[PDB]
Structures are given as structure tokens and as C-alpha cells.
Design a protein around this ligand. Structure first.
Ligand SMILES: Cc1cc2nc3c(=O)[nH]c(=O)nc-3n(C[C@H](O)[C@H](O)[C@H](O)COP(=O)(O)O)c2cc1C
Length: 355
């Protein structure tokens, strides 16, 4: 089983290649990490195993879900440190995913009910609805297209959040540039209708993610920085006319950032020759594949060299010992979609049984 051959992910030595994918669970009440999160990640932590936390707010305007953790206040760093210690006390490596939803927000999630910010003024179409704090579903509003000065301010929010994560004890961070959120709103030409230096050509549309990665790399180091993208996922109207060309353009800038920094990024994380094999071959460094992978598909991806690590999402919600179950080829538990985003600290969160 190649999933349990060790792997060197920069400075971190992993004992297996099963990774916990980032998953918003909405148990961080009032954007403050709770003790339930520490129990949740501890259940899933393994000695030498890699964990990626739920998307974490970088600023008061970055949230589009209820009760998602932040890492932009000192109270948030204080609470995150207790969760990181418990995870580290089981021998695991943990990255904090920095997450800005962009236009994928709503009045109720914004300070003073302000409009969400984005690369464009176009809202997410009527086909998608946002989850509201009371469990209902609302309408995505018109975002406010930000200028270039505000862009550099959002980049500074990524930078300050990356330092706060290291302050909390995180081994590193992952840049959330997937699933049609703020960074994807600049990447995809189905959303980015700008005419300034951040829109139009592939180079202009890759400029925002390039500045975000360079800023956090300069702050904490490249080997503590992971990047996640999803060129071929159309979530929230995040379509590109050429997802392969866009994905290869992003890899080219990531490869260049590593050359200009003298170090490799922690990894490239792609969720969805296959599109995934093409980006892996083009990227000079560690590759994590994500999306619909099983035990056999993950074994095969590592054996054929398609990826170095495999992240599992939904199966990790219902199987806290998913790493052990994959090792023993033990039957897995079903997950309950109803409690994906509820607020109970136990029900549908930490009460999924171990083997
Ligand atoms: C409830 C839920 C929350 C998720 N939250 C995030 C997130 O915050 N950031 C992210 O990049 N992906 C998020 N994802 C996507 C997963 O990380 C993963 O890419 C996707 O679930 C496919 O993995 P799987 O088929 O193994 O479940 C989430 C998925 C689910 C089901």
C-alpha cells in the first residue's frame, strides 16, 4: 500500500499520504474557535498525518458562512493555539486554510450589512443560494468591484493572517483559491470582467493569486505555504473558457515564485491525459489530488505517480479514524449531509464512531 510509504513535504516528514481536506463545519461560534474543534481535529489527527483546517476568515469581510473561524483577531489566535497543541500532541501536521469568499457572501455576514467585495459587480446567478444563519437559504447580492488599492489591502489581510497562524502554532497555511470564492473570482474569465491590470489576459487574471502567494511566502516562507485551486469546478458560476490553460498559467506563476524565492512551496492542491495529471506534470513540487477519491483510487494515484498526497473530504467527516480504516481496508461510515453546517458541538461532528 503506497498510501503508507513516508513522504517529505518540505520540512515536514509525513508517515502516510492520507490528508484531511479543508471542510467548513460552522462550529466556530461567533467566528471564535471552540473546544469542539479541538476534539474534532484530535479525533482525526494521526502521528505523521497531515491535516488542513476548515476555511478561516482573514478579515471581518471575508465570511460567507455562519460561525466559521477567523484568525484576524488576537482572541482567535488564542483559541486556535489550544486546538493546534492538541493536534500536535498526537503527532500530526496541521495547516490553516485562509479563506475569503469574495462575492459569495450576504448582508447578514458583512460588517454594517455592507456589500461583499469582488473583482466584479456581477452577482452570483439566481441558480445558487447562500446558507443563512437561521438555516434558510438567501439570495446572493451584488458585490462591490474593488480597486487596485483595496486589492493590496486584501493581500495584506492574507499576509497578516498567515503570520497569525504561525503565531497560533500552525505548521503552515493553505491559500484558498478554489470553488469560486474571492481568488477564483479573479482567476476565472467567466467572472473577471475587469479592464484594468487585474483582468483580461491570463497574466492579468493570475495577478491576484500571484500577489497573495508571494506576500504569504515572504512572511512565513515558501515551505509553509500550500495553494489550492479548482480550474474545472463551476461552483458559484466559476467557469473559465479554458480551464486547462488557466490551470497551467497558475502553475507557471507558482513555479516562478519558487524560483525567485529559492525554495519550493509546501504543495499544490488541485480539487476536481486527465486535467489533474497535466497540472501535476507541470508543477515542480508536491501535488495533492482531491475530489471523489476512494481507497483504491487514492492507492492508484500514488502508485502511478499521479499525486504525492491524497486528501479526503466527506469520508473524513464520518470516519475519524479514516487513516486506520484505509490501512486495514475496513468498512467506512456514512456521513449525514444534514449536519454538515449545523452548530451542535457533538451531533454530526464528534459523535461519528471509531472502528
Ligand atoms: C461540508 C463541506 C465543507 C467543505 N469546506 C471546504 C472549505 O472550507 N475549503 C475548501 O477548499 N474545500 C471545502 N470543501 C471541499 C472539500 O475540501 C473537498 O474538496 C470535496 O469535498 C471533495 O472531496 P471528497 O470527495 O473526498 O469529499 C468542503 C466540502 C464539504 C462537503
Amino acid at each position: 500500500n503506497p498510501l503508507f510509504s513516508p513522504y517529505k513535504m518540505g520540512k515536514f516528514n509525513l508517515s502516510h499520504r492520507v490528508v484531511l481536506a479543508p471542510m467548513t463545519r460552522c462550529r466556530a461560534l461567533n467566528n471564535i474557535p471552540q473546544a469542539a474543534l479541538g476534539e474534532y481535529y484530535e479525533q482525526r489527527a494521526t502521528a505523521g498525518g497531515f491535516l488542513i483546517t476548515e476555511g478561516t476568515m482573514i478579515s471581518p469581510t471575508s465570511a460567507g458562512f455562519p460561525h466559521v473561524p477567523g484568525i484576524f483577531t488576537k482572541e482567535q489566535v488564542r483559541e486556535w493555539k489550544k486546538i493546534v497543541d492538541v493536534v500536535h500532541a498526537k503527532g500530526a501536521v496541521i495547516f490553516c486554510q485562509l479563506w475569503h469568499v469574495g462575492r459569495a457572501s450576504h448582508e447578514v455576514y458583512q460588517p454594517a450589512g455592507a456589500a461583499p467585495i469582488s473583482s466584479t459587480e456581477k452577482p452570483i446567478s439566481n441558480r445558487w443560494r447562500i446558507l443563512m444563519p437561521d438555516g434558510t437559504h438567501g439570495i446572493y447580492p451584488k458585490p462591490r468591484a474593488i480597486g487596485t488599492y483595496e486589492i493590496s489591502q486584501v493581500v495584506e489581510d492574507y499576509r497578516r493572517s498567515a503570520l497569525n497562524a504561525i503565531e497560533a502554532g500552525f505548521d503552515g497555511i493553505e491559500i484558498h483559491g478554489a470553488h469560486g470564492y474571492l481568488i477564483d473570482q479573479f482567476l476565472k474569465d467567466g467572472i473577471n470582467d475587469r479592464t484594468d491590470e487585474y483582468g483580461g489576459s491570463l497574466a492579468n487574471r493570475c495577478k491576484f493569486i500571484t500577489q497573495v502567494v508571494q506576500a504569504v511566502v515572504s512572511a512565513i516562507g515558501a515551505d509553509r505555504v500550500g495553494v489550492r485551486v479548482s480550474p474545472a469546478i463551476d461552483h458559484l458560476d466559476a467557469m473559465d473558457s479554458n480551464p486547462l490553460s488557466l490551470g497551467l498559467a497558475v502553475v507557471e506563476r507558482l513555479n516562478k515564485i519558487q524560483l525567485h524565492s529559492g525554495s519550493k512551496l509546501a504543495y499544490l492542491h488541485v480539487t476536481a491525459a486527465r486535467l489533474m495529471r497535466t497540472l501535476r506534470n507541470a508543477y515542480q513540487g508536491t501535488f495533492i489530488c482531491s475530489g471523489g477519491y476512494t481507497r483504491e483510487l487514492g492507492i492508484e494515484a500514488v502508485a502511478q505517480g499521479d499525486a504525492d498526497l491524497v486528501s479526503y473530504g466527506r469520508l473524513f467527516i464520518s470516519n475519524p479514524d479514516l487513516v486506520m480504516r484505509i490501512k486495514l481496508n475496513a468498512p467506512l461510515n456514512k456521513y449525514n449531509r444534514k449536519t454538515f453546517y449545523t452548530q451542535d458541538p457533538v451531533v454530526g461532528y464528534t459523535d461519528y464512531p471509531f472502528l
